[PDB]
Structure formats: C-alpha cells, structure tokens
Design an enzyme around this catalytic site. Structure first.
Site, PDB file in Angstrom:
ATOM      1  CB  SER A  14      -1.001   0.049   1.239  1.00 32.87           C
ATOM      2  OG  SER A  14      -0.335   0.006   2.362  1.00 32.87           O
ATOM      3  CD  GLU A  25      -3.686  16.060   4.719  1.00 39.96           C
ATOM      4  OE1 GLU A  25      -5.021  16.711   4.826  1.00 39.96           O
ATOM      5  OE2 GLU A  25      -3.267  15.527   5.826  1.00 39.96           O
TER       6      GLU A  25
HETATM    7  C1  LIG Z   1      -1.867   7.286  -4.781  1.00 43.31           C
HETATM    8  C2  LIG Z   1      -1.736   7.479  -3.330  1.00 43.31           C
HETATM    9  C3  LIG Z   1      -2.548   6.820  -2.512  1.00 43.31           C
HETATM   10  C4  LIG Z   1      -2.717   7.356  -0.920  1.00 43.31           C
HETATM   11  C5  LIG Z   1      -1.589   8.469  -0.606  1.00 43.31           C
HETATM   12  C6  LIG Z   1      -0.913   9.239  -1.595  1.00 43.31           C
HETATM   13  C7  LIG Z   1      -0.717   8.807  -2.940  1.00 43.31           C
HETATM   14  C8  LIG Z   1      -0.088   9.177  -4.159  1.00 43.31           C
HETATM   15  C9  LIG Z   1       0.078  10.406  -1.122  1.00 43.31           C
HETATM   16  C10 LIG Z   1       1.340   9.495  -0.453  1.00 43.31           C
HETATM   17  C11 LIG Z   1       0.622  11.247  -2.140  1.00 43.31           C
HETATM   18  C12 LIG Z   1      -0.576  11.122  -0.115  1.00 43.31           C
HETATM   19  C13 LIG Z   1      -1.240  10.301   0.982  1.00 43.31           C
HETATM   20  N1  LIG Z   1      -1.718   8.926   0.463  1.00 43.31           N
HETATM   21  C14 LIG Z   1      -2.075   8.005   1.734  1.00 43.31           C
HETATM   22  C15 LIG Z   1      -2.897   7.096   1.340  1.00 43.31           C
HETATM   23  N2  LIG Z   1      -3.548   6.305   2.249  1.00 43.31           N
HETATM   24  C16 LIG Z   1      -3.017   6.231   3.638  1.00 43.31           C
HETATM   25  O1  LIG Z   1      -3.360   5.720   4.606  1.00 43.31           O
HETATM   26  N3  LIG Z   1      -2.176   7.340   3.742  1.00 43.31           N
HETATM   27  C17 LIG Z   1      -1.539   8.307   3.088  1.00 43.31           C
HETATM   28  O2  LIG Z   1      -0.984   9.008   3.607  1.00 43.31           O
HETATM   29  N4  LIG Z   1      -3.268   6.677   0.223  1.00 43.31           N
HETATM   30  C18 LIG Z   1      -4.318   6.005  -0.276  1.00 43.31           C
HETATM   31  C19 LIG Z   1      -3.977   4.372  -0.067  1.00 43.31           C
HETATM   32  O3  LIG Z   1      -3.105   3.847  -1.093  1.00 43.31           O
HETATM   33  C20 LIG Z   1      -5.291   3.590  -0.631  1.00 43.31           C
HETATM   34  O4  LIG Z   1      -6.497   3.919   0.322  1.00 43.31           O
HETATM   35  C21 LIG Z   1      -4.953   2.276  -0.605  1.00 43.31           C
HETATM   36  O5  LIG Z   1      -6.376   1.517  -0.664  1.00 43.31           O
HETATM   37  C22 LIG Z   1      -4.367   1.690   0.544  1.00 43.31           C
HETATM   38  O6  LIG Z   1      -4.129   0.127   0.512  1.00 43.31           O
HETATM   39  P1  LIG Z   1      -4.849  -0.881   1.417  1.00 43.31           P
HETATM   40  O7  LIG Z   1      -6.259  -0.979   0.749  1.00 43.31           O
HETATM   41  O8  LIG Z   1      -4.039  -2.237   1.080  1.00 43.31           O
HETATM   42  O9  LIG Z   1      -4.820  -0.367   2.855  1.00 43.31           O
HETATM   43  O1  LIG Z   2      -2.132  12.608   2.560  1.00 39.99           O
HETATM   44  C1  LIG Z   2      -2.892  12.450   1.758  1.00 39.99           C
HETATM   45  O2  LIG Z   2      -3.322  13.463   1.071  1.00 39.99           O
HETATM   46  C2  LIG Z   2      -3.932  11.373   1.780  1.00 39.99           C
HETATM   47  C3  LIG Z   2      -3.862  10.508   2.769  1.00 39.99           C
HETATM   48  C4  LIG Z   2      -4.828   9.317   2.806  1.00 39.99           C
HETATM   49  C5  LIG Z   2      -5.513   8.886   1.599  1.00 39.99           C
HETATM   50  F1  LIG Z   2      -5.332   9.602   0.345  1.00 39.99           F
HETATM   51  C6  LIG Z   2      -6.559   7.951   1.536  1.00 39.99           C
HETATM   52  F2  LIG Z   2      -7.362   7.472   0.595  1.00 39.99           F
HETATM   53  C7  LIG Z   2      -6.922   7.138   2.997  1.00 39.99           C
HETATM   54  F3  LIG Z   2      -7.538   6.331   2.793  1.00 39.99           F
HETATM   55  C8  LIG Z   2      -6.050   7.696   3.729  1.00 39.99           C
HETATM   56  F4  LIG Z   2      -6.349   6.881   5.019  1.00 39.99           F
HETATM   57  C9  LIG Z   2      -5.201   8.726   3.889  1.00 39.99           C
HETATM   58  F5  LIG Z   2      -4.588   9.011   5.040  1.00 39.99           F
HETATM   59  K   LIG Z   3      -3.773  -1.858  -1.660  1.00 39.92           K
END
Ligand SMILES: Cc1cc2c3c(c1C)C(C)(C)CC=[N+]3c1c([nH]c(=O)[nH]c1=O)N2C[C@H](O)[C@H](O)[C@H](O)COP(=O)(O)O
Ligand SMILES: O=C(O)/C=C/c1c(F)c(F)c(F)c(F)c1F
Ligand SMILES: [K+]
Ligand SMILES: Cc1cc2c3c(c1C)C(C)(C)CC=[N+]3c1c([nH]c(=O)[nH]c1=O)N2C[C@H](O)[C@H](O)[C@H](O)COP(=O)(O)O
Ligand SMILES: O=C(O)/C=C/c1c(F)c(F)c(F)c(F)c1F
Ligand SMILES: [K+]
Ligand SMILES: [K+]
Ligand SMILES: [K+]
Ligand SMILES: [Mn+2]
Ligand SMILES: [Mn+2]
EC number: 4.1.1.102
Lengths: 500, 500
Positions: free
Chosen positions: B167, B279
């Site tokens: 993830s 974000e």
């Molecule tokens: C594409 C993408 C997905 C981010 C993401 C970003 C991008 C570029 C960032 C790094 C630029 C900014 C923050 N993001 C987070 C994030 N999910 C999360 O829990 N914390 C984050 O900090 N996600 C979304 C997360 O990848 C999805 O919710 C997945 O479904 C998590 O995988 P899982 O279902 O196996 O938990």
């Molecule tokens: O840091 C950010 O802009 C996004 C964090 C983020 C996310 F994009 C997600 F889809 C989540 F499900 C999640 F739990 C997150 F924390």
């Molecule tokens: K995933």
C-alpha cells in the site's frame, strides 16, 4: 444608433466583431434554425443570422440566434453581453453585473416619446396577418407549440399607470391571432396581471416588442425591484433617455427601433394550452401541456427586413444561463448588502445549471459579527429565499475571500471540501420553490414549495480568528521568487496565448 | 522488461511517448522539483524527470514527478495510467478500472522468488546512510518534514504469514534512520500493525520499495479486500507471476527491479511528529503536527542511477485524484454489484475533489425491484459507507442510464437538476468519516464520524415506468437526419481534431 440602443446596430456590431455567421441560403424554421443555434450554444460558436428563412413573406422575418451566448475565447468570453451594454468586449462578469446594478442608486431617466421610428415602417392589421403563417420556429422537437417569443420584451402597465414593466416570458402561437405563455408568480407580468384581474373590468393592454435595444432586453431579464419601471432604470444605466413610440391600438409605448411589435391584450379570463418547452435546466417532458395565459394580437408593426432574435435554450450555454442566472445573482448580491450581510460578490455557476448562487463573504466583516454558521446561514437564507430575486435559486453556497465566485472550478472545490453535508447546511422547506427545476415540478415533493438549502463553505476559523490554511497549489505552496523562476524557465526546460 | 513490470522501463515508455521532460541541469529538492511537478499537474504537462538533483550522492537519487497524472489531450488523457497496465494509451477510464477489477474473480498468481535483481546493485548499511543527507524533497513550503514517501509501496505481513499487504501511505524523514508517517484505520497497514501490537512481542518487519512495477503501485493504491495479498492480485491482473527478491535484513520480499528499498521495522510502541502535509483535497494547515507511526530504517538497497517517483499532491490533478478516487470508485462499483445493487459504473468526479462517487444505475433492474428513493438510498449508503472501500467518499450520487459518470459535466448537471436538496438525500452520521477532508478534521463536527450523504439524482419515473423526458440538447432535441445535415453543412455555413 449605438449598438446598446438599437438591435439593428447590435447585429452590425456582432458582424464587425467577427462574431456572426450570415446564412443566406434557405433554412427551415421547423427545427433547423434552432438546431444550428443549439450547436452554436453548446460549442460557443459565432451567432447565426438566418437571412433566408423558409416561410418569410413581406418582410417577416429573419432570425438571429444565440444573441446572449458565450464566445469561445476566454479573453472575450462575455463579449456578446458586453455588446448589449456599451462595455468593451473583454469586460469581466463583475463589470457586466456592476453595470446592470449601477442604476439601482441613481435617479431614473424616464423615456422620451417620439412621433415615429423604424418599428412603424410596416404594419398589418387584424385582417392582414395570421400568426400560423409566419416562419415561427419549432425550437425543440417535442415542444408543444412554435415559440415565437424567446427573446422579446412583454410590456404591461399597472391599472393606475404608475409602473410599466418590461420582462421576458416565453410564449407560443395558439392560433392566427393568439399566443399562450407562462405567467406565474412571483414574476412582475403576473403581479400586474393580478392587479387587472382584481379590478375585473378589462383585459390587460399589452405589447410584445422583439429586437429591442440590447440594454433594455438585459433589464427585461433582471429582477429589478417591484414597482420599478425598467425603461427608467435602463435610461439611468445607459445615461440616456430611451426613445419610445406609442402603439397604434393602445396607449403603451415601445422602443422606436424595435424590429417587430405585437399589440393586443393579455386576457384576465381566458387560458389555453401552453408547453411543454425545452427549458433552461436542460429538459423537456414531452406531452406535459398545461393551461397558460392567453394573449390576443390585434396589430403587428415591423421594420423593413425585420430580424427576430431567438434563444434555443436547454443544456449549457445560452441566454437562460448567461442572463437569467447572472442577473439574478447580481440582484441577490445587492439584496444581501442592503440587508447588512457582508457579501462582496455573487454568481450562479454554470455547472449548477444556474440553480446555485455562490456568495463571496468579506470575512473580516464576518469576524466582527461574532456569529456562527447556523445563525449566519439562517439569516442569509431568510433574506434571499423570501425575496423574488431568490426565486430561481435553490442552493446558496457561502465562500470566503479566497474564492473567485465567477470561476466554477473554484466554487466546486470550496463546496466539496469546506461544507460538511448536513451539519453545515440549513434546509428551507417553507419558501417558494422554482417549479421548472425537474426535481421540483417533476419530483418527489411539492412543486412550488421548499427544496432550498444554504450550504456554508466557510471554514470555522473564518468566523473567529481568520483563515488557517494555505492551498496546496502552485500559487500558495511556493514562494514568489521560486514561482517566477519556474515560470521564466518553463519553455527552456521543455514544457508548453491570452487572446486566443 | 515490460513497462508495466519494471519502473525503469516505464520511464522509457514515457520518453518514447513524448510524455517526459528530462531536466539535466541542477534542480533543488527543496521546493523546486515539487514546484515544477505541481505546475505540470495543474496544466496536464509532460512528466518531469530530474536527472541532476542537488544533493544526489553515490547514486541516490533522481526524481520522476507526476507518474500518474493526466495528459493534455483528450484522446490519451489517461495514457500515463494505461502505461502502468500494458493498456493502449488511448484506453478509457472504464477500461482502466475494468483492468484493475479483473483479478477479483481470478485465482491469485503468487509471486516467484529469484536470487537477485537490480534493486541489489548497491547497498548501504546502518553505518553508511543518513536519511537527512539524501535529496529528499520538501514538497510544499509549509510541510512539517521532507516527504520521502509519496509513491513507494509499504510492505508488511500479518504475524501468521498469511497476508502480505502492499500500500501507499505517506511518510517523512524524522532523523538519520527513522521516518514518521500516517498509519490510520481502516487502512491495511493499520490493520496489520494492530495485529502485531496485540501480539506484543516485536516491532513489525517492514520494507518500503520505491520505483516498483507500475502494475504493483496501482494495486497498492486500490482498496482490494481485507486479507488479499496484492502481489498475487497483480500477478493475476497481468497474467504473470511477479519476481521478488528477499530483503537482506528481514524475510520480506520486494520487487526485483525496485529502484530503491528501505528495510527495517514499523514500531509497535513509538511515535513521532508527523505532518502537516499538502494533501489530496488541496490544503495544508500549517503547524498542524500530530504524532504518527515511526519506522526505523536498517538498510537501503538501490539500483544504479536510482530514480525516486514523487507525487506533488494538492489541487487538481495528480495521483491522489486519478488513482485514489478512481480506484476506490472501481472497488465500490464491484461491492455494489456483489450486494445485488443494480450499479453499472462508478467514478469519483474530479470536480468533487474525489469526495463524491457517481453511481450509474441500470434502471431496468431498478424498476423490477419495485422500490422507492428512500429505501434504495438507504440500502446503497449502508453497503458503501459501512465498508472500507467507501472510506474516502462522503457523497454518493445516484444517476440513471443516460449519464456518463466518467464525465463530470454530466454528473454535475444530473446532481443539480434531479436531486431535490434534503428530500432526495439521506444523511449518514453513524459511519466512519475521512478526517483529511477539511470539513471533517478541521470542521464543525466529529473528525472521524459522519458527514456522509446519499444524493438520489434518479427521477421518480426511473423507479416505476421509465424516463419521461428528453434532453434539451443537440443530441436529443432534433432528429437524426437533421443533426447529420447540420454537421455536414457546419464548416460550409461558416462555423468552426480528435487526437490533438
Ligand atoms: C496514490 C496515493 C495513495 C495514497 C496516498 C498518496 C498517493 C499518491 C500520497 C502519499 C501522495 C498522499 C497520501 N496517501 C495515503 C494513502 N493512504 C493512507 O492511508 N495514507 C496516506 O498517507 N493513499 C491511499 C491508499 O494508497 C489507498 O487507500 C489504498 O487502498 C491503501 O491500500 P490498502 O487497501 O491495502 O490499505
Ligand atoms: O496525505 C494525503 O493527502 C492522503 C492520505 C490518505 C488517503 F489519501 C487515503 F485515501 C486514505 F484512505 C487515507 F487513510 C489517507 F490517509
Ligand atoms: K492496496
Ligand atoms: C433571458 C430569458 C429570461 C427568461 C426566459 C427566457 C430567457 C431567454 C426564455 C424565453 C428562453 C425561456 C423562458 N424565460 C421566462 C422567464 N421568466 C418567466 O417568467 N417566464 C419565462 O418563460 N425568464 C426570466 C425572467 O426574464 C426574469 O426572471 C425577469 O427577472 C423577469 O422580469 P421581472 O422581474 O420584471 O418579472
Ligand atoms: O421556460 C424556461 O426555461 C424558463 C422560465 C422561467 C424562468 F427562466 C425564470 F427565471 C423564472 F423566474 C420563471 F418564472 C420562469 F418561468
Ligand atoms: K425585468
Ligand atoms: K463549513
Ligand atoms: K431525485
Ligand atoms: Mn420588473
Ligand atoms: Mn490491501
């Protein structure tokens, strides 16, 4: 005559702007003219002037479509509206709306009566015309009639003579000498009609003038206050008294350069089938005919080589969006300010199908009010939704000073990110609703009541101590000197004109 | 190696597509790289490859920005995503989402272990690296740290060995050998972390691989089901078993061609300051630091001339919109169908800042259900908002079969015209909320609960007898033969290319 004072001059101005396509080969008023115009409006193309309309006889009539629609370029996007008002073609929507509000704290400049004008060049008495024989367009394939009236001005006067209203309300041909149309509350044509009905003695003297001065059609589309005669408001806005000529068969006065004038009566007793019509929200409900007001036509006068303006309305973007929405928003802005609300700007986003108005708040003033979202939403909604200027608008979106309400992308960003569904909203069920919205008149609830909301997209600290974020965008997330470096080096590095 | 299986090959593919700008002069990781990338994302420009990063030493590192962002042309708008998946660059969003769902009714294809790969070309033990000395970007000027991790894949495994999750979760440098990051419910990294915490015996073995196979980073961004190992899902989607190499300091397995790998532990006890960060919703709240999870790095391995992907996220349009929103929408579509709901399509409109999902309904199926809006909204909202795939989404918009949910203009038209505020909506206050939306975590109510809504933009007859309108548009308001005539005569008359 200047373009804002004379429709014929306006058409010339569009030509000179390279904003006109003259179509000199035969075009059918049965759907073809309107189809071309519809495609114009959906693509922001040049306005079509149909010089060779199948069924034109003895000078009645040519058609101009899309008179108030958008141009393709950003730089002169609102140029057609600017040409209604003597403004430069690059005028912003703020400048256009300010021009339309300017007469609200000016003395009226009443009209000037002159003995004749171009609208008297030709005439047809009640033995010489038949409305069913004119090249009246079928605008949408399921319309319930041929809608002659989509961009003319109805003229009616209170029984006591003290208020003469000019407004756009649709109308269609009923028979050789009658139209049917919408006359509904709280519109001024309806309010005047009610005064005549209560007097009970006669039908309402009426005229319908097509191809009026552009500045007059703009005020005709704006909800200026009850009791205010549009002619004097337009006089004050333009700085000039409008020249009017008396009708031949009644004592109403029409613009001297009107292209086409119908004279007659709006009945206080009779009705006839009206609609359905492809409307501003983008829909038609085929077969949805209902009884509307009935007009009798006694006389037609018209210019040599008369031109009928037409709005082929529906999905974005046409006069029903650019004029209805924006002009309501302008009046709402003023109404809010007059009720001591700290509103700087208002606009009806096109993306909302002009059913929303975004209200930009001066948050420094807001903070001094020492209020809360619940209280403030209620106050704004009571002012707007209890007033005729709010009639067409079902959602108000409150936004802080960082948002340009004239940019729908930014309104949508603020709405989606700053207004918590439910908690940050106040529903209004005991206000007049706009039945033409499909979810109203064809929806699950009362057609005429409720369905309104104030959505607060102000963040909590905007009420207290001030904005506590920065945008995560190029503009706000990087210092000035860096942004400028990036911009200066953009094409040198390998990355990709205002007018366009 | 194919582009979808190898990040280095992916970069080549972008070059060959004329979708890459190589910047070979020095660029500062302190804001400059991210500013350039931000401007790319706001303008749909070519992806930037920063080959000469100030502070790069001994091969660590170059940066690729905007790996999953949009191209300017309509025809290949999603081409960068298509290049993650072996799809043609003209692939539609429907085709991309279907590819991402395809493995859901396939047997997994587990990964293949190989003895070495390019990710082992170089190594640095715990006496040889310092994370504070690497050219880690400052992405937004108010960020609370240098966010090394914006497009790598965290790898953690359940204590029992049976589920290995991949993830994306953000992380920033804490000190020479630690990161801090977000680890929050209901995310799978959090769920696994909780299993280790309850066992209480050790820190979680962890790796973070940057520049992984593009098809793997896409699944890393998608909420596939609990307990499903992403590697085998990606194997099934691509038709090939992914090649993985064992870490040196733990028994996790990383993609053989990873650009850069960090090996270490995610603490079950320790925390450190994390954030704020610019974000996905478009904001940063300066100074908003809170305790996050803490990772210890024991080893770095990396390719010769290693490239670090970076997302400069914020306002539209970047990976947080194209990938988070669309991939959640895809999983929601499937979830709805598995719960016997007549949903054909789902997409998160960019205009909503990917906080909405529009659900296209098969209205023939709906009609056979013999239900009502109130009942149906409740059923849809219970399914979606009680599931992890609905976590990020606060508004569901139900639309009928005429609406292309992949076109935000059409979703906004339907929402604004077919859903009566209040009456046609159901609020959900007792569901998990997404705190990162500003109106949640910085709003007027609980950060973690409620604030969700189902908005029904289905019209009444769509539940009963069928659609009873036609659009007032060029397509629907005019017969076929006329439209074609207009189109054929368009340029001949005087009015104004697919690829562009
Ligand atoms: C594409 C993408 C997905 C981010 C993401 C970003 C991008 C570029 C960032 C790094 C630029 C900014 C923050 N993001 C987070 C994030 N999910 C999360 O829990 N914390 C984050 O900090 N996600 C979304 C997360 O990848 C999805 O919710 C997945 O479904 C998590 O995988 P899982 O279902 O196996 O938990
Ligand atoms: O840091 C950010 O802009 C996004 C964090 C983020 C996310 F994009 C997600 F889809 C989540 F499900 C999640 F739990 C997150 F924390
Ligand atoms: K995933
Ligand atoms: C620009 C414009 C304005 C339309 C309009 C159209 C256009 C092109 C149409 C003709 C194409 C379709 C229907 N329209 C009607 C309409 N108002 C109304 O009561 N009935 C209508 O049928 N209006 C809006 C009306 O002009 C404004 O609400 C005015 O404020 C009315 O003036 P008043 O305030 O003096 O009543
Ligand atoms: O026929 C149409 O599409 C618009 C009719 C219409 C209107 F546009 C308005 F703004 C009104 F205030 C009104 F009462 C109306 F009836
Ligand atoms: K008016
Ligand atoms: K709010
Ligand atoms: K509805
Ligand atoms: Mn009036
Ligand atoms: Mn997972």
């Amino acid at each position: 005559q200047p373009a804002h004072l004379c429709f014929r001059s306006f058409v010339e101005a569009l030509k000179v702007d390279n904003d006109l396509v003259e179509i000199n080969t035969p075009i059918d008023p049965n759907l073809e003219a309107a189809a071309i115009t519809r495609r114009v409006c959906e693509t922001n193309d040049k306005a079509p002037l149909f010089n060779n309309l199948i069924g034109m006889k003895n000078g009645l009539f040519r058609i101009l479509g899309a008179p108030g629609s958008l141009r393709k370029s950003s730089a002169d996007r609102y140029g057609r509206l600017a040409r209604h008002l003597a403004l430069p073609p690059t005028a912003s929507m703020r400048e256009i709306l300010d021009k339309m509000l300017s007469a609200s704290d000016m003395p009226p400049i009443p009209p000037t009566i002159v003995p004749t004008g171009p609208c008297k060049e030709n005439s047809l008495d009640d033995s010489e015309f038949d409305l069913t024989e004119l090249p009246v367009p079928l605008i949408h394939k399921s319309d319930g009639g041929k809608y002659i009236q989509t961009y003319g001005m109805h003229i009616v006067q209170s029984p006591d003579g003290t208020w003469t209203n000019w407004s756009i309300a649709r109308a269609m041909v009923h028979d050789k000498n009658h139209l049917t149309g919408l006359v509904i509350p709280p519109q001024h044509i309806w309010q005047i009609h009610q005064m005549w009905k209560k007097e009970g003695r006669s039908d309402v003297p009426w005229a319908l003038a097509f191809g009026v001065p552009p500045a007059a059609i703009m005020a005709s589309s704006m909800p200026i206050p009850d009791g205010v005669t549009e002619a004097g408001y337009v006089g004050a806005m333009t700085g000039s008294s409008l020249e009017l000529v008396k009708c031949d068969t009644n004592d109403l006065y029409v613009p001297a350069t009107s292209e086409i004038v119908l004279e007659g009566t709006l009945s206080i007793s009779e009705t006839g089938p009206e609609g359905p019509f492809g409307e501003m929200h983008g829909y038609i409900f085929p077969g949805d005919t209902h009884l509307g007001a009935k007009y009798k036509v006694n006389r037609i006068t018209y210019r040599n080589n008369a031109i009928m303006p037409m709005s082929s309305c529906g999905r974005l973007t046409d006069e029903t969006h650019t004029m209805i929405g924006s002009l309501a928003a302008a009046e709402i802005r003023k109404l809010c300010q007059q009720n001591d609300l700290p509103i700087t700007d208002a606009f009806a986003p096109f993306e909302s199908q002009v059913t929303w108005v975004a209200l930009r708040v001066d948050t420094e003033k807001l903070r001094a009010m020492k209020t809360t979202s619940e209280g403030f939403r209620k106050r704004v909604g009571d002012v707007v939704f209890n007033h005729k200027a709010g009639y067409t608008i079902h959602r108000l979106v409150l936004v802080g000073d960082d948002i340009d309400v004239y940019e729908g992308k930014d309104v949508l960003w603020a709405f989606s990110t700053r207004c918590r569904p439910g908690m940050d909203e106040t529903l209004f069920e005991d206000v007049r609703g706009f039945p033409l919205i499909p979810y109203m008149g064809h929806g699950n609830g009362p057609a005429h009541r409720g369905g309104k909301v104030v959505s607060d997209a102000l963040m909590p600290t905007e009420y207290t101590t001030g904005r506590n974020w920065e945008a995560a965008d190029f503009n706000q997330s990087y210092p000035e000197d860096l942004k400028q470096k990036v911009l200066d080096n953009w094409t040198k590095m390998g990355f990709s004109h205002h007018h366009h």
